[PDB]
Amino acid sequence: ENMTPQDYIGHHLNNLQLDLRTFSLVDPQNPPATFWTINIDSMFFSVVLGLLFLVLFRSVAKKATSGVPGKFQTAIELVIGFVNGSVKDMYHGKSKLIAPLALTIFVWVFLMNLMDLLPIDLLPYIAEHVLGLPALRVVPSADVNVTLSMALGVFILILFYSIKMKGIGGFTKELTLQPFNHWAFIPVNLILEGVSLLSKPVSLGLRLFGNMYAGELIFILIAGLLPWWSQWILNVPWAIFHILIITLQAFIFMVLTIVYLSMASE
Amino acid sequence: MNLNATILGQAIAFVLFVLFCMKYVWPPLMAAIEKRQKEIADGLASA
Amino acid sequence: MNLNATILGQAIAFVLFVLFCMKYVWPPLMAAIEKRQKEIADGLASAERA
Amino acid sequence: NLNMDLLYMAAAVMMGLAAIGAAIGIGILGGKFLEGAARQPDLIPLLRTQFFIVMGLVDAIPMIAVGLGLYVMFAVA
Amino acid sequence: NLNMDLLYMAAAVMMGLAAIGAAIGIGILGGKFLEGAARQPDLIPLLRTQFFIVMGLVDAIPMIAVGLGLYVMFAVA
Amino acid sequence: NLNMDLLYMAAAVMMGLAAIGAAIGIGILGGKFLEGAARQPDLIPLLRTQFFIVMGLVDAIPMIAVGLGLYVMFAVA
Amino acid sequence: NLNMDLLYMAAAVMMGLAAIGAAIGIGILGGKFLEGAARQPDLIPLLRTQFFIVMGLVDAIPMIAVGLGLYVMFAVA
Amino acid sequence: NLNMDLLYMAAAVMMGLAAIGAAIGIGILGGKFLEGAARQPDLIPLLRTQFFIVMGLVDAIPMIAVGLGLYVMFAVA
Amino acid sequence: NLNMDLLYMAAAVMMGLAAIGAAIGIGILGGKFLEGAARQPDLIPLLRTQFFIVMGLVDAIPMIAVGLGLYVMFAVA
Amino acid sequence: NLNMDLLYMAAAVMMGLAAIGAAIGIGILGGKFLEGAARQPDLIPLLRTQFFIVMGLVDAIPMIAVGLGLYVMFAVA
Amino acid sequence: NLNMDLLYMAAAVMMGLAAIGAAIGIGILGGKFLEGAARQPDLIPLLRTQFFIVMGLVDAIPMIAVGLGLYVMFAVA
Amino acid sequence: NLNMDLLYMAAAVMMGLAAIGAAIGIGILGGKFLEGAARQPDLIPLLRTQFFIVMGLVDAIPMIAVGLGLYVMFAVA
Amino acid sequence: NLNMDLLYMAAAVMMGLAAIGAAIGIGILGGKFLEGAARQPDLIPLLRTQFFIVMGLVDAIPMIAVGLGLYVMFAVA
């Protein structure tokens, strides 16, 4: 196998893609220029981790008994109580959406980040040799398009809650008369609150993408550049630090979503 | 990296999983937890 | 570059990470779950005896 | 070739300056969280939620710069 | 050619300095919030309200700089 | 010619440094306002009135620099 | 080429550094004014007249640099 | 050619500014931990737990800049 | 022609750096004057006298930097 | 050729910025240790043990930058 | 042409950085003098004598940097 | 030839930035020692011992940058 | 030859950064000495003895940087 290590590092950063003009597989030496080239590997791991979250939680939710709970039931009720405690402190309205939205965001972003901890060659090896696919990378949140899709979901909810709670009165006032109050500042206020509004989702998405992309890139570099007897000493400290990062970046996506929808609605 | 039709494909997946979690997962889990919290609170009401 | 060497080094690094994760990470998680089962058992015993 | 080297030096300015800004901004904010947690330890969960609210503002602007630096290297190349 | 390349460098200095300014400014302001909240926990909703008023001014000039950085990269490129 | 892009670089340095000065100057000033409002919560209208007097001076020199940056980018270059 | 674009870059260095210096210097001074006002709410007119004495000196040396930067752009270039 | 040595310079700017950001941010954060540890010496493990929670956030952005600095230096060419 | 055109850049660096030094130095020094005036309000004319003595020392090096900058623009270039 | 001269420049800027970050980070952290010791010297061995824990993290990123600076200077040469 | 220009630029960076060092160092030292004067005003002639001793050390190393700056402009030309 | 111009400039950056890092780090650490010595005389030899332990760490990275700057001037150039 | 003017520029950056580091380092150290003297005015010769010990360490790295910069300017150029 002809690998120079720079080329191994290059191939590891390439996705698997579907060309919707043809339903072909975009081979990773010539990329089509179209915007209709869906990434299969982040889509497959995103939906399979979303299904696994819903299967585990529905299995307990359907059985759950208010006696002394079982050990697995107690683990799921701990994460339900942690999400509800966070929502109940940060948000005070009547909405039925904010609590389950915060549950799906926390558990799905945690599961997507948790794929990053697994050995960087193991699933791409199985996909190259056994399935015969031209490429694979297996962390969904590391790819931009999933994190911007979730951040635009929260943007559309920020607009829905700000219009519904305050509509022809409130949203036009907060866009035009803040921060500088007087009507002479309206053009400046509209630019500053416009960019403030747009900064909330774009930073949600880029926060999560940037942390997971640089996290995966270190495992690709440590695997690529260092000889086998010496990888473990740098790799084990990076994996131990990354366990802290996967839980913090899942929790911050949940917290900032609740805080932005709470501040929009109330 | 390249912005792509995956952004739409993920947007369909997210809204389906939020609707299934909202109706099916959250009401039965929170009903079971709050049913136990009420039975302990009535256990204090005996005192 | 030897690809099989990179697989060997990743295996050694994963086994050392799993031994850390089992001893440091799993005892806190199992202790939190058993603390909840203890607090619910005491709470239901107290509630039903009262 | 010539166009690409300057593009890697443009990303190095965005990501270096945003790494200084975000790390020291969160360090100042987090130091005041740890001070308040030592004064009244029973408030530590409340002050933790206020810290995560304010920290999302502090590193919001630096994350636009970090994300566009990653765009410049990986997409514009 | 060089005009296009230097415009990516020019946006990189706008967004780097806007990131340092916003992150340090909000970090200092937010630290004084999180220390007032630990000393006076009944006042948190008042101090939170005044924090969001003041933080809108701290945001105002960095948002001009970052919004023009995005314009320079994407529009004139 | 190169010149039209060293006008974008000149405006970028001028407007970025003005965003550093405006954001940190109001960050420091606003932190001391919130510390005073935490001690004296019946004096929030008085302290907020004085804060707007001194904050106008902090903004005055950065607002000149940001205005001349917009002139160089849009009207000259 | 070089004459005009270097004169705009020189004016950008003068007004960028004057905006850093004037905004942070008045921010620090104004923070001690607003804590003095919260500590002595009977003395806002006495402390604000002292603040205007000090502020004149702080702004004076940046105002040389801003006025000369405007001369460089408008009357040299 | 010139390509390689300018890529090594761009890596040096990312790696240096990440070392500034990480060392100053954790130095400020750690100083407030040590004064809290002196104030409440029974609560050192509680304050150390929160210190590691916020230290993960302070280190996170500099580690993005370190990872890309190693990619530019070793892997791009 | 580049020799004189860069002399305007040399003066811009020299007086800009002197303006950040002088404005922040007098800002810190004046902040401690206003805090002293708030703590001992019958003492203000004595403390203001001492502020003017030390303000003359702080200005002495920046004022020769600004004077040599003006000489470089007007007399050399 | 120029490659070696720029590689010595790259190693120098990376190690200079690492030396600023590491020395000021430990200077701030150590200052808070020495004042916590002066208040009650019965805690010197306890605070010194926590100081060595925190100081390890402060050193960790600057030593990556020094290790790469030494590699550039000696091995890329 | 450019040799004589670059000598004037070398004096501009040498005196600019010396003006920052001299003004900030005396601004900090004079602020702590003024707080000592406000706390014990009968002690001012003693504290002023100690200030002139400490200030002479602070100012002496910028003054050799300034003296060499004037040597480069006036004597080396 | 060109080698000496760039090698003396590389040493000058390395040793200048190390002189910032060492002088600010020991200035902050030493100031906290001197407030401890004024607060508790008769502890001066114990606090001086801790100050020399911490000073060894603060100096350690700047001393690498000084030693390599001396190598670059005397052995490479 | 270009070698002369680059050697004067290298000396200028080495001595400018040394003058910032040494002036601000002694300014911080001296400010804590003067508040120690204002608190304990019968101890001033003891605190002078410790201040001169610590000042020797602060100056030791900048005085090497000045000594080598002055050697580069006079002997090498």
* Tokens, residue F5: 């892009």
- One-letter amino acid of K45: P
Task: Please name every residue paired with A25 in a beta bridge, in sequence order, or none if there are none.
Answer: A18
Q: Which residue has the tokens 């994963």?
A: C14
Please indicate whether chains C and B are in contact, defined as at least 3 beta carbon pairs under 8 Å. yes
Interface residue ranges in chain E relative to chain D, Cβ cutoff 8 Å: 1, 5-6, 8-9, 11-13, 15-24, 26-28, 30-35, 37-39, 41, 44, 48, 51, 55, 62, 66, 69-70, 73
Which distant-in-sequence residues (6+ apart) come within 8 Å of F16 by Cβ? E13, E14, E16, E17, E18, E21, E65, G16
CB-based contact F66:F18 (threshold 8 Å): yes
D59 three-class SS: coil
Half-sphere exposure of L44 toward its Cβ, with a 13 Å CA cutoff?
Answer: 14
Neighbours of A175 (CB within 10 A): 17
State the alpha helices, DSSP H only, in chain D. 2-39, 44-58, 60-71
The residues on K that touch I, with CB distances below 8 Å, are 1-2, 4-5, 8-9, 11-13, 15-24, 26-28, 30-35, 37-39, 41, 44, 48, 51, 55, 59, 62-63, 66, 69-70, 73
Q: For residue B40, give the nearest of A78, C40, A81, C38 by alpha carbon.
A: C40
Query: What whole-number distance in Å separates Cα of residue A70 and Cα of residue C33?
Result: 10
Distance of CA L1 to the CA centre of its chain: 32
The answer to whether residues K51 and M34 touch, using CB atoms and an 8 Å cutoff, is yes
Partners of A37 in beta bridges: A19
Interatomic CA distance for residues A146 and B10, integer angstroms: 6
- Rounded to a whole number of angstroms, the distance between the first and last alpha carbons of chain A is 60
Distance from CA of E53 to the nearest CA of D (A): 13
Residue K57, classified by CB atoms within 10 Å of its CB into exposed (0-12), middle (13-18) or buried (19+), is buried
For chains L and M, having 3+ Cβ pairs within 8 Å is answered: yes
Residue C28 to residues A76, C32, F41, Cα–Cα distance (Å): 16, 6, 43
Which two structure tokens, joined as six digits, stand for A65?
Answer: 């008994």
Does residue A141 sit in helix, strand or coil? coil
CA distance A59 to A56: 5
With both helix axes pointing from N to C terminus, report the angle between M2-39 and K44-70 in degrees, rounded to the nearest 10. 180
- What is the C-alpha radius of gyration for chain D, rounded to an integer number of angstroms? 17
Determine how β-strand A17-19 pairs with β-strand A24-25: antiparallel
> Distance between CA D7 and CA E5 in Å, rounded?
7
| Residue M59 annotated in active site | yes
Determine whether F48 is exposed, middle or buried from the number of CB atoms within 10 Å of its CB (0-12, 13-18, 19+).
middle
Q: How far is C48 from chain B (nearest CA, A)?
A: 6
d(CA H42, CA H39): 9
Output the six-digit token pair for B12: 């369909």
Strand segments (E) across L1-62:
none
> In the 8-state DSSP scheme, what is residue A14?
P
> A232: domain range?
42-265
Q: What are the angstrom distances between the C-alpha of E32 and each of A193, A251, D36, E23, E27?
A: 24, 24, 11, 14, 9
Rounded to whole angstroms, the Cα distance separating L17 from J12 reads 9
Does H71 sit within 8 Å of A9, measured CB to CB? yes
Q: Kindly identify which residue of chain H lies nearest to residue A212, measuring between CA atoms.
A: H64
CA-wise closest residue to G69 among E68, F12, K7, G77? G77
Cβ partners under 8 Å of residue G28, min gap 6: F28, I24, I27, I28, I31
Token pair for B8: 């739409």
What is the greatest pairwise CA distance in chain H? 60
Shortest distance, CA A208 to any CA of chain E (angstroms): 18
Going from the C-alpha of F57 to that of each of E20, E43, F22, G23, the distances in angstroms are: 21, 29, 10, 8
SS3 F7: helix
Asked if the peptide bond before residue A119 counts as cis, ω within 30 degrees of 0, the response is no
CB of G4 closer than 8 Å to CB of F1: no
CA-closest candidate to residue D61, choices E21, E11, A86: E21
DSSP string over I21-65: HHHHHHHHHHHHHHHHHHH-GGGHHHHHHHHHHHHHHHHHHHHHH
Cα dihedral sign for H47, H49, H50, H51? positive
**How far is residue L54's CA from residue L26's CA, in Å, rounded to a whole number?**
9
Q: Could A3 and C17 be called an inter-chain contact, meaning their C-beta atoms sit closer than 8 Å?
A: no
Class of domain J1-77: mainly alpha
Best L8, L40, L43, L49 member to test M by mutation, with max M CBs in 10 Å, is: L8
Q: Is residue A5 included in any domain, yes or no?
A: no
DSSP per position, A176-192: HSTTT-SGGGHHHHHHH
Contacting A residues, span 51-110, partner chain H, CB-CB under 8 Å: none
Domain ranges of chain G: 1-77
Asked if I64 and I2 touch (Cβ cutoff 8 Å), the reply is no
**Could you identify the residue written with the tokens 């580091």?**
M21
Other CB atoms within a 10 A radius of the CB of residue K33 amount to: 31
Contact I1, I71 (CB under 8 A): no
Terminal-residue alpha carbon distance, chain C = 72
User: What whole-number distance in Å separates Cα of residue A215 and Cα of residue A220?
Assistant: 9
Tell whether the torsion through CA atoms of A207, A213, A219 and A224 is positive or negative: negative
Would you put residue A181 in left (φ > 0), alpha (ψ -120 to 50) or beta? left
- Which residues in chain A precede a discontinuity of more than 2.5 Å between C and N? none
CA diameter of chain J:
60
Give A17's DSSP letter: E
Q: Which residue in I40, G34, E44, E56 sits closest to F43, CA to CA?
A: G34
Q: How far is K14 from chain I (nearest CA, A)?
A: 8
Pairwise CB contact (< 8 Å): A179 & E67: no
3-class SS of residue G56: helix
Beta carbons of L35 and J33 less than 8 angstroms apart: no
Distance CA L62, CA L59 (A): 5
The one-letter code for the residue type at H28 is: I
Asked if E47's CB is within 8 angstroms of F37's CB, the reply is yes
Radius of gyration of chain F, Cα coordinates, nearest whole angstrom: 17
Where do breaks (C to N over 2.5 Å) occur in chain B, by preceding residue number?
none
DSSP D28-48: HHHHHHHHHHHH-GGGHHHHH
M73 CB-near residues (< 8 Å, 6+ apart): K68, M7, M8, M11
Q: How is residue D74 written in tokens?
A: 């990986």
Neighbours of K70 (CB within 10 A): 14
Q: Which sign does the torsion angle of CA H3, H9, H12, H14 carry?
A: negative
3-state SS string for F19-49? HHHHHHHHHHHHHHHHHHHHHCCCCHHHHHH
Residue J56 CB-density burial (10 A; 0-12 exposed, 13-18 middle, 19+ buried): exposed
Cα separation of G67 and J70, whole Å? Answer: 47
Burial of D36 (0-12, 13-18, 19+ CB in 10 A): buried
Candidates E17, E46, E59, E71, partner chain F, best to mutate (most F CBs within 10 A): E17
For residue A24, list its beta bridge partners: A19
Check if the beta carbon of residue A79 is closer than 8 Å to that of residue C29.
no
Helix (H) or strand (E) holding A38: strand A37-39
| Cβ within 8 Å of residue M8, ≥6 positions away | K6, K7, K10, K72, K76, M73, M77
Name the maximum alpha-carbon separation found in chain G.
60
The single residue listed with the structure tokens 């390249």 is B2
Across-strand partners of A17? A39
Distance CA H32, CA H43 (A): 14
CB D60 within 8 A of CB A206: no
Q: Which residues of L are catalytic?
A: 59
Are I34 and G34 within 8 A, CB to CB?
no
Q: What is the DSSP letter of L1?
A: -
Put simply, the answer to whether C44 touches B46 (Cβ < 8 Å) is: no
**Length of chain I in residues, anyone?**
77
The two tokens of residue A169 are 């009165």
**Measuring CA to CA, which residue among F12, F9, F22, F64 is closest to residue G70?**
F64
Terminal C-alpha separation, chain H: 12
Compute the half-sphere exposure of residue A97: CA atoms within 13 Å on the CB side of its CA. Answer: 14
Please give the structure tokens belonging to residue G67.
């006025």
Q: Tell me if H68 sits within 8 A of H11, measured CB to CB.
A: no
The span from the CA of H74 to the CA of H72, in Å, is 6
Q: Which two tokens stand for residue A266?
A: 């109330």
Rounded Cα gap, residues D8 and A49, in angstroms: 35
Interface F:A, ≥3 CB–CB pairs < 8 Å: no
Q: What is the DSSP letter of C25?
A: I
Q: Which pair of structure tokens corresponds to residue I73?
A: 């623009």
Please state, in angstroms and as integers, the Cα–Cα distance from residue K63 to each residue in H76, K69, M31, following that order: 47, 10, 20
CA distances from F38 to D50, E28, G41, H7 (A): 16, 16, 14, 50
Q: E strand or H helix at D1, and its extent?
A: none
Q: What region, left, alpha or beta, does residue A23 occupy, with left being phi > 0 and alpha being psi -120 to 50 degrees?
A: left
Measured distance CA(F51)–CA(J68) in Å, rounded: 48
Chains that touch I (3 or more CB pairs under 8 A): G, K
Quick check: L62 and J23 CB within 8 A? yes
Does the distance separating the beta carbons of E56 and A179 come in below 8 Å? yes
Most I CBs within 10 Å: which of K1, K3, K8, K54, as the mutation test of the I interface?
K8
Which amino acid is located at H73 in the chain?
M
Is residue J71 within a helix (H) or strand (E), and if so which, with residue range? none
Q: Say if the Cβ atoms of F54 and G30 lie within 8 Å.
A: yes
Return phi, psi of residue B21, to 5°: -65, -40
∠ Cα B17 B22 B26 (to 5°): 120
What DSSP string describes K11-24?
Answer: HHHHHHHHHHHHHH
The one catalytic residue in M26, M30, M44, M59 is M59
**PDB resolution in Å:** 3.3
Chain I neighbors of G64, CB-CB under 8 A: 15, 19, 66
Partners of A39 in the beta sheet? A17
Q: What is the residue type of G61?
A: I
CA distances from A192 to A166, A188, B38, E61 (A): 20, 6, 48, 9
Give the integer Cα–Cα distance in Å for F18 and G16: 6
SS3 C2: coil
Two structure tokens written together for M36: 């120690």
**Closest to A103 in 3D by CA, of A42, A41, A58:** A58
φ and ψ of G43, to 5 deg = -115, 15
- Determine contact, residues M65/L15, Cβ cutoff 8 Å: yes
Q: How far apart are CA H38 and CA K57, in angstroms?
A: 34
Rounded distance between C-alpha atoms, residue D50 and residue E32, angstroms: 12
As given in the structure block, the two tokens for residue K27 are 């601004």
Beta strands A24-25; A37-39: pairing state: unpaired
Query: Cβ–Cβ of A252/D53 closer than 8 Å?
Result: no
Going from the C-alpha of A251 to that of each of A113, A156, A243, D49, the distances in angstroms are: 12, 21, 13, 11
Is the Cβ–Cβ distance between I47 and I36 less than 8 Å?
yes
CB contact under 8 A, H75 and A244: no
Closest to D58 measured CA to CA, from E22, F16, F31: E22
From the list A260, A256, A241, A11, the residue with the least C-alpha distance to A109 is: A256
Per the listing, tokens 């007086």 go with I15
Q: What residue type is assigned to position A81 of the chain?
A: G
Residues 6+ apart with CB under 8 A from A48: none
Q: How far is the first Cα of chain L from the last one, in angstroms, to the nearest whole number?
A: 11
CA–CA separation, G44 and F35 (whole Å): 17
What's the rounded Cα separation, in Å, for the pair B6 and B29?
32
* E strand or H helix that includes residue M77: none
3-state helix vs strand vs coil in chain B, percent to 5: 85, 0, 15
SS3 of residue H36 by DSSP: helix
Q: Are F5 and E2 in contact (CB under 8 A)?
A: yes
Burial of E41 (0-12, 13-18, 19+ CB in 10 A): middle
In 3D, which of A79, A207, A228, A118 has the Cα closest to residue A154?
A: A207
